[PDB]
Amino acid sequence: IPVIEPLFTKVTEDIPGAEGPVFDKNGDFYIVAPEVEVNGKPAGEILRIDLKTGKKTVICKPEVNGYGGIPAGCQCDRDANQLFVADMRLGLLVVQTDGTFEEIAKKDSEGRRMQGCNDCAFDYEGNLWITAPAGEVAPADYTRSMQEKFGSIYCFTTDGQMIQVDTAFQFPNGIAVRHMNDGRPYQLIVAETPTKKLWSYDIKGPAKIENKKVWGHIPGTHEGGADGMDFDEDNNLLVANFGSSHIEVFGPDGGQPKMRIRCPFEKPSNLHFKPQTKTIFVTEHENNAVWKFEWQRNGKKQYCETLKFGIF
Numbered sequence: 001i002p003v004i005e006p007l008f009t010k011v012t013e014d015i016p017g018a019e020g021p022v023f024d025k026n027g028d029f030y031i032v033a034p035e036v037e038v039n040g041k042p043a044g045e046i047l048r049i050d051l052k053t054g055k056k057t058v059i060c061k062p063e064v065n066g067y068g069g070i071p072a073g074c075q076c077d078r079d080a081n082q083l084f085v086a087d088m089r090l091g092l093l094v095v096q097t098d099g100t101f102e103e104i105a106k107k108d109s110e111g112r113r114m115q116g117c118n119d120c121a122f123d124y125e126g127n128l129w130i131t132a133p134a135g136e137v138a139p140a141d142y143t144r145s146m147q148e149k150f151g152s153i154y155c156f157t158t159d160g161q162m163i164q165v166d167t168a169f170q171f172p173n174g175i176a177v178r179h180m181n182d183g184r185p186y187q188l189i190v191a192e193t194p195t196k197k198l199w200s201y202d203i204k205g206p207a208k209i210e211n212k213k214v215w216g217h218i219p220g221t222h223e224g225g226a227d228g229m230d231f232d233e234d235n236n237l238l239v240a241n242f243g244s245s246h247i248e249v250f251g252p253d254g255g256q257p258k259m260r261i262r263c264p265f266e267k268p269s270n271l272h273f274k275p276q277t278k279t280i281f282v283t284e285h286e287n288n289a290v291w292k293f294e295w296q297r298n299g300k301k302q303y304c305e306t307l308k309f310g311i312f
Protein backbone atom coordinates (compact mmCIF):
# COMPACT_ATOMS: atom_id res chain seq x y z
CA ILE A 1 0.00 0.00 0.00
CA PRO A 2 1.55 3.33 -1.04
CA VAL A 3 2.59 5.43 1.97
CA ILE A 4 2.99 9.21 1.81
CA GLU A 5 5.02 11.18 4.34
CA PRO A 6 3.73 14.77 4.53
CA LEU A 7 5.35 17.34 6.83
CA PHE A 8 3.68 17.50 10.24
CA THR A 9 3.77 20.88 11.98
CA LYS A 10 3.34 21.23 15.75
CA VAL A 11 0.12 23.00 16.80
CA THR A 12 -0.07 22.69 20.60
CA GLU A 13 1.15 20.35 23.34
CA ASP A 14 0.41 18.81 26.75
CA ILE A 15 -3.29 17.95 26.35
CA PRO A 16 -4.03 14.67 28.23
CA GLY A 17 -5.60 12.37 25.67
CA ALA A 18 -5.91 15.15 23.06
CA GLU A 19 -9.10 14.33 21.19
CA GLY A 20 -12.15 15.62 19.33
CA PRO A 21 -10.47 18.31 17.14
CA VAL A 22 -13.11 20.69 15.78
CA PHE A 23 -13.58 24.09 14.16
CA ASP A 24 -16.63 26.20 14.93
CA LYS A 25 -18.57 28.61 12.66
CA ASN A 26 -16.02 31.40 13.27
CA GLY A 27 -13.10 29.15 12.47
CA ASP A 28 -12.01 28.85 16.09
CA PHE A 29 -10.22 25.60 16.91
CA TYR A 30 -11.19 23.26 19.75
CA ILE A 31 -9.71 20.13 21.35
CA VAL A 32 -10.93 17.99 24.23
CA ALA A 33 -8.70 16.67 26.99
CA PRO A 34 -10.71 13.61 28.18
CA GLU A 35 -7.90 12.24 30.33
CA VAL A 36 -7.38 15.20 32.68
CA GLU A 37 -7.75 13.97 36.29
CA VAL A 38 -8.13 15.46 39.77
CA ASN A 39 -7.30 12.94 42.52
CA GLY A 40 -7.94 9.89 40.35
CA LYS A 41 -11.39 11.16 39.36
CA PRO A 42 -12.37 12.31 35.83
CA ALA A 43 -12.00 16.04 35.19
CA GLY A 44 -11.98 16.17 31.39
CA GLU A 45 -11.72 19.52 29.61
CA ILE A 46 -12.79 21.30 26.45
CA LEU A 47 -10.19 23.76 25.21
CA ARG A 48 -10.00 26.57 22.69
CA ILE A 49 -6.65 26.65 20.91
CA ASP A 50 -5.17 29.86 19.47
CA LEU A 51 -3.72 28.52 16.19
CA LYS A 52 -1.21 31.38 15.96
CA THR A 53 0.40 30.99 19.41
CA GLY A 54 -0.49 27.43 20.37
CA LYS A 55 -1.80 28.88 23.62
CA LYS A 56 -4.58 26.83 25.19
CA THR A 57 -7.67 28.04 27.06
CA VAL A 58 -9.98 25.68 28.94
CA ILE A 59 -13.51 26.86 28.30
CA CYS A 60 -15.34 23.99 29.99
CA LYS A 61 -14.57 21.34 32.60
CA PRO A 62 -17.93 19.45 32.55
CA GLU A 63 -19.31 17.93 35.75
CA VAL A 64 -22.82 16.73 36.61
CA ASN A 65 -23.66 16.36 40.30
CA GLY A 66 -19.97 16.04 41.10
CA TYR A 67 -19.24 13.55 38.33
CA GLY A 68 -16.46 14.89 36.13
CA GLY A 69 -16.71 14.30 32.42
CA ILE A 70 -14.45 12.61 29.88
CA PRO A 71 -15.21 14.73 26.75
CA ALA A 72 -13.87 12.76 23.79
CA GLY A 73 -15.42 13.82 20.48
CA CYS A 74 -16.89 16.95 18.93
CA GLN A 75 -19.14 18.24 16.15
CA CYS A 76 -20.07 21.87 15.59
CA ASP A 77 -23.75 22.71 15.14
CA ARG A 78 -25.04 24.59 12.09
CA ASP A 79 -27.94 26.76 13.27
CA ALA A 80 -26.03 27.99 16.31
CA ASN A 81 -22.33 28.23 17.08
CA GLN A 82 -22.31 25.52 19.76
CA LEU A 83 -20.39 22.25 20.11
CA PHE A 84 -22.01 18.85 20.57
CA VAL A 85 -19.62 16.82 22.70
CA ALA A 86 -19.54 13.06 23.17
CA ASP A 87 -18.60 12.52 26.82
CA MET A 88 -17.47 9.14 28.13
CA ARG A 89 -19.04 9.83 31.55
CA LEU A 90 -21.83 12.30 30.80
CA GLY A 91 -23.18 11.14 27.41
CA LEU A 92 -24.01 13.90 24.93
CA LEU A 93 -23.36 17.50 25.92
CA VAL A 94 -23.84 20.81 24.20
CA VAL A 95 -21.14 23.34 25.02
CA GLN A 96 -21.41 27.05 24.25
CA THR A 97 -18.40 29.22 23.38
CA ASP A 98 -18.79 31.02 26.71
CA GLY A 99 -17.96 27.69 28.33
CA THR A 100 -21.40 26.80 29.70
CA PHE A 101 -22.88 23.39 28.88
CA GLU A 102 -26.03 21.30 29.12
CA GLU A 103 -26.40 17.54 29.46
CA ILE A 104 -28.59 16.30 26.61
CA ALA A 105 -29.84 12.96 27.96
CA LYS A 106 -29.74 10.66 30.98
CA LYS A 107 -31.92 8.13 29.13
CA ASP A 108 -32.58 7.19 25.49
CA SER A 109 -35.91 7.21 23.57
CA GLU A 110 -36.76 3.83 25.09
CA GLY A 111 -36.28 4.93 28.72
CA ARG A 112 -32.99 2.99 28.88
CA ARG A 113 -30.11 4.69 30.75
CA MET A 114 -27.73 6.64 28.52
CA GLN A 115 -24.27 5.27 27.70
CA GLY A 116 -21.03 7.26 27.67
CA CYS A 117 -20.19 8.55 24.20
CA ASN A 118 -16.87 8.86 22.38
CA ASP A 119 -17.36 10.45 18.97
CA CYS A 120 -20.17 11.80 16.79
CA ALA A 121 -21.04 12.89 13.25
CA PHE A 122 -23.73 15.28 12.03
CA ASP A 123 -25.30 14.35 8.72
CA TYR A 124 -26.51 17.10 6.35
CA GLU A 125 -30.05 16.61 7.66
CA GLY A 126 -28.87 17.67 11.11
CA ASN A 127 -29.07 14.26 12.75
CA LEU A 128 -26.19 13.31 15.05
CA TRP A 129 -24.76 9.80 14.85
CA ILE A 130 -22.94 8.93 18.08
CA THR A 131 -20.72 6.06 19.20
CA ALA A 132 -21.17 4.95 22.82
CA PRO A 133 -18.30 2.60 23.80
CA ALA A 134 -18.73 3.25 27.52
CA GLY A 135 -21.29 1.70 29.82
CA GLU A 136 -23.99 3.70 31.55
CA VAL A 137 -23.32 7.39 32.23
CA ALA A 138 -22.56 8.70 35.72
CA PRO A 139 -23.54 8.09 38.54
CA ALA A 140 -22.89 4.54 37.29
CA ASP A 141 -19.43 3.05 37.87
CA TYR A 142 -17.39 3.70 34.70
CA THR A 143 -17.05 0.80 32.24
CA ARG A 144 -15.88 0.57 28.60
CA SER A 145 -16.44 -1.99 25.85
CA MET A 146 -12.75 -2.64 25.04
CA GLN A 147 -13.14 -6.32 26.02
CA GLU A 148 -16.88 -7.04 26.04
CA LYS A 149 -19.39 -6.10 23.34
CA PHE A 150 -21.70 -3.61 25.08
CA GLY A 151 -20.85 -0.56 22.97
CA SER A 152 -23.84 1.10 21.32
CA ILE A 153 -24.68 3.51 18.50
CA TYR A 154 -27.12 6.40 18.85
CA CYS A 155 -28.83 8.92 16.63
CA PHE A 156 -29.82 12.20 18.23
CA THR A 157 -32.48 13.51 15.84
CA THR A 158 -33.69 16.97 14.82
CA ASP A 159 -36.90 16.37 16.79
CA GLY A 160 -34.79 15.72 19.92
CA GLN A 161 -34.98 11.93 20.25
CA MET A 162 -31.93 10.02 21.50
CA ILE A 163 -32.41 6.78 19.62
CA GLN A 164 -30.24 3.72 20.07
CA VAL A 165 -29.80 2.38 16.54
CA ASP A 166 -27.41 -0.50 17.23
CA THR A 167 -25.71 -2.37 20.04
CA ALA A 168 -23.07 -5.01 20.82
CA PHE A 169 -19.92 -3.32 19.54
CA GLN A 170 -16.47 -3.84 21.03
CA PHE A 171 -15.63 -0.17 21.49
CA PRO A 172 -17.44 1.75 18.72
CA ASN A 173 -15.17 4.73 18.13
CA GLY A 174 -14.80 7.02 15.13
CA ILE A 175 -17.87 7.74 13.08
CA ALA A 176 -18.66 9.47 9.78
CA VAL A 177 -21.54 9.92 7.36
CA ARG A 178 -21.28 9.62 3.59
CA HIS A 179 -23.47 11.91 1.50
CA MET A 180 -24.59 11.77 -2.12
CA ASN A 181 -23.50 14.71 -4.28
CA ASP A 182 -26.94 16.29 -3.76
CA GLY A 183 -26.34 16.21 0.00
CA ARG A 184 -28.49 13.22 0.92
CA PRO A 185 -27.03 11.02 3.73
CA TYR A 186 -26.87 7.36 2.65
CA GLN A 187 -24.07 5.53 4.42
CA LEU A 188 -22.80 5.47 8.02
CA ILE A 189 -19.27 4.33 8.90
CA VAL A 190 -18.48 3.10 12.41
CA ALA A 191 -15.02 2.27 13.71
CA GLU A 192 -14.74 -0.73 15.99
CA THR A 193 -11.25 -0.12 17.40
CA PRO A 194 -9.89 -3.45 18.78
CA THR A 195 -11.33 -5.67 16.03
CA LYS A 196 -9.57 -3.65 13.32
CA LYS A 197 -12.87 -3.19 11.50
CA LEU A 198 -14.81 -0.34 9.93
CA TRP A 199 -18.54 -1.03 9.85
CA SER A 200 -21.08 0.39 7.40
CA TYR A 201 -24.87 0.77 7.29
CA ASP A 202 -27.19 2.17 4.68
CA ILE A 203 -28.89 5.27 6.06
CA LYS A 204 -32.52 4.83 5.03
CA GLY A 205 -33.61 7.85 7.03
CA PRO A 206 -33.23 9.84 10.29
CA ALA A 207 -32.24 7.25 12.90
CA LYS A 208 -32.83 4.47 10.35
CA ILE A 209 -29.89 2.26 9.52
CA GLU A 210 -29.91 -1.15 7.87
CA ASN A 211 -27.64 -3.68 6.19
CA LYS A 212 -24.75 -3.73 8.70
CA LYS A 213 -21.54 -4.73 6.90
CA VAL A 214 -17.80 -5.06 7.57
CA TRP A 215 -16.85 -2.20 5.21
CA GLY A 216 -13.13 -1.79 5.79
CA HIS A 217 -10.16 -3.57 7.32
CA ILE A 218 -7.68 -1.65 9.49
CA PRO A 219 -3.99 -2.73 9.11
CA GLY A 220 -1.88 -4.12 11.97
CA THR A 221 -2.06 -6.46 14.95
CA HIS A 222 -0.88 -3.75 17.36
CA GLU A 223 -2.99 -2.67 20.32
CA GLY A 224 -5.41 -0.02 19.11
CA GLY A 225 -6.99 0.35 15.68
CA ALA A 226 -9.46 2.71 14.01
CA ASP A 227 -10.02 5.73 16.22
CA GLY A 228 -11.20 9.04 14.73
CA MET A 229 -12.22 9.53 11.09
CA ASP A 230 -13.35 12.08 8.49
CA PHE A 231 -14.09 12.17 4.75
CA ASP A 232 -12.22 14.41 2.32
CA GLU A 233 -14.08 16.28 -0.45
CA ASP A 234 -13.86 13.27 -2.80
CA ASN A 235 -15.35 10.97 -0.14
CA ASN A 236 -12.08 9.21 0.68
CA LEU A 237 -12.21 8.14 4.33
CA LEU A 238 -9.21 9.11 6.47
CA VAL A 239 -8.94 7.06 9.65
CA ALA A 240 -6.51 7.48 12.55
CA ASN A 241 -5.08 4.00 13.12
CA PHE A 242 -4.13 4.29 16.81
CA GLY A 243 -0.91 2.42 17.56
CA SER A 244 0.13 2.01 13.92
CA SER A 245 1.95 5.32 13.33
CA HIS A 246 -0.42 5.89 10.36
CA ILE A 247 -3.69 7.40 9.19
CA GLU A 248 -5.40 5.08 6.73
CA VAL A 249 -6.99 6.40 3.55
CA PHE A 250 -9.89 4.37 2.19
CA GLY A 251 -11.43 4.88 -1.22
CA PRO A 252 -15.23 5.50 -1.58
CA ASP A 253 -15.77 1.72 -1.69
CA GLY A 254 -13.72 0.74 1.38
CA GLY A 255 -12.09 -2.66 1.79
CA GLN A 256 -8.35 -2.23 2.19
CA PRO A 257 -6.74 1.23 2.48
CA LYS A 258 -5.58 2.65 -0.87
CA MET A 259 -2.92 4.78 0.84
CA ARG A 260 -1.39 5.26 4.29
CA ILE A 261 -0.09 8.48 5.85
CA ARG A 262 2.95 8.05 8.08
CA CYS A 263 2.77 10.20 11.23
CA PRO A 264 5.93 11.15 13.20
CA PHE A 265 4.21 9.47 16.18
CA GLU A 266 2.65 6.07 16.89
CA LYS A 267 -0.73 7.01 18.32
CA PRO A 268 -2.82 9.23 16.01
CA SER A 269 -6.18 9.61 17.76
CA ASN A 270 -8.48 11.90 15.81
CA LEU A 271 -8.36 14.42 12.97
CA HIS A 272 -10.28 17.34 11.50
CA PHE A 273 -9.98 19.49 8.38
CA LYS A 274 -9.69 23.26 8.62
CA PRO A 275 -12.69 24.57 6.56
CA GLN A 276 -11.80 25.46 2.94
CA THR A 277 -8.27 23.94 3.15
CA LYS A 278 -6.22 20.75 2.74
CA THR A 279 -5.00 21.18 6.33
CA ILE A 280 -5.70 18.27 8.66
CA PHE A 281 -5.24 18.81 12.37
CA VAL A 282 -4.29 15.54 14.06
CA THR A 283 -4.43 14.62 17.74
CA GLU A 284 -2.13 11.92 19.13
CA HIS A 285 -1.66 10.25 22.53
CA GLU A 286 2.07 9.47 22.44
CA ASN A 287 3.03 13.07 23.29
CA ASN A 288 -0.55 14.21 23.98
CA ALA A 289 -0.22 16.81 21.23
CA VAL A 290 -1.85 18.31 18.16
CA TRP A 291 -0.27 18.55 14.72
CA LYS A 292 -1.36 19.64 11.26
CA PHE A 293 -0.32 18.46 7.81
CA GLU A 294 -1.39 19.03 4.21
CA TRP A 295 -3.62 16.41 2.59
CA GLN A 296 -4.07 16.12 -1.20
CA ARG A 297 -7.35 18.06 -1.27
CA ASN A 298 -10.00 19.87 0.76
CA GLY A 299 -12.06 18.11 3.40
CA LYS A 300 -15.70 17.19 3.01
CA LYS A 301 -17.80 20.04 4.34
CA GLN A 302 -18.98 19.45 7.89
CA TYR A 303 -22.62 20.03 8.85
CA CYS A 304 -21.66 23.41 10.39
CA GLU A 305 -20.34 24.53 6.99
CA THR A 306 -23.64 23.95 5.17
CA LEU A 307 -26.49 26.45 4.83
CA LYS A 308 -29.99 26.13 6.25
CA PHE A 309 -31.22 28.71 3.76
CA GLY A 310 -28.82 27.99 0.90
CA ILE A 311 -30.56 27.95 -2.49
CA PHE A 312 -27.99 25.54 -3.96
Ligand SMILES: [Ca+2]
Pocket: 019, 072, 073, 118, 119, 173, 174, 227, 228, 269, 270
Ligand atom coordinates in the same frame (compact mmCIF):
# COMPACT_ATOMS: atom_id res chain seq x y z
CA1 LIG B 1 -12.12 8.58 19.68
Ligand SMILES: [Ca+2]
Pocket: 021, 228, 229, 230, 270, 271, 272, 273
Ligand atom coordinates in the same frame (compact mmCIF):
# COMPACT_ATOMS: atom_id res chain seq x y z
CA1 LIG C 1 -13.06 15.11 12.89
